Design a protein around this ligand. Structure first.
Ligand code: CU
Ligand code: CU
Lengths: 117, 119
């Protein structure tokens, strides 16, 4: 029930997968926003979570896989993945992506940058 | 029930306020994502909508007002505004912001770009 603000910082990024760093920026009662720093050559494995995922690529170049379909993602592109839909990605260059989850993905709250507000 | 993708395009931006252009990128069952292009000197007036608003500043420099708090926002900063909370902003330089609303703000679906494909 309280609003928060997060300043851009290259620190407090926690390791999630080989070449993938994660950091929860802000969250509320219905959303949660994370930032992914993905190195060239890394990938996100296939997952199905009960959270809708809408994202935005800040920089870089990735390939997003939804079901069996593939789409090349560049700076400025966006996407929206519904609940329980198979999705994975392959990172072609050093990329940065912002991802929002609905509802509040409580397992990602532990990735808070500790600063916030 | 359909996933979607939107390609970056400098077109399909509709005017919302003097100096403020809006474009709905994608939306789903619980969220809706828009992109705001804000000219230098413009501002967003005070509003209270029944939608949680979490945003990210792609570029520029603005001053975000949430309730009684004031904060200067620069590139890379983010925020989260709860439902029915007073908020407004003053745009200091040519800025671009991405904003997500929860639940799906159906009134902003009319700003959807033509370049959004399904799956
Ligand atoms: Cu996911
Ligand atoms: Cu608002």
């Amino acid at each position: 029930m309280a609003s928060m603000y997060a300043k851009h910082s290259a620190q407090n990024y926690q390791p999630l997968l080989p070449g993938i760093k994660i950091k929860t920026l802000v969250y509320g009662e219905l959303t949660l926003m994370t930032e992914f720093v993905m190195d060239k050559g890394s990938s996100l494995p296939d997952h199905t979570h009960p959270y809708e995922q809408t994202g935005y690529l800040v920089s870089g170049k990735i390939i997003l896989y939804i079901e069996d379909k593939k789409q090349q993602i560049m700076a400025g592109d966006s996407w929206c993945i519904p609940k329980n839909v198979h999705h994975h990605a392959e990172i072609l260059e050093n990329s940065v992506a912002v991802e929002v989850f609905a509802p509040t993905r409580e397992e990602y709250i532990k990735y808070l940058d500790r600063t916030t507000v």
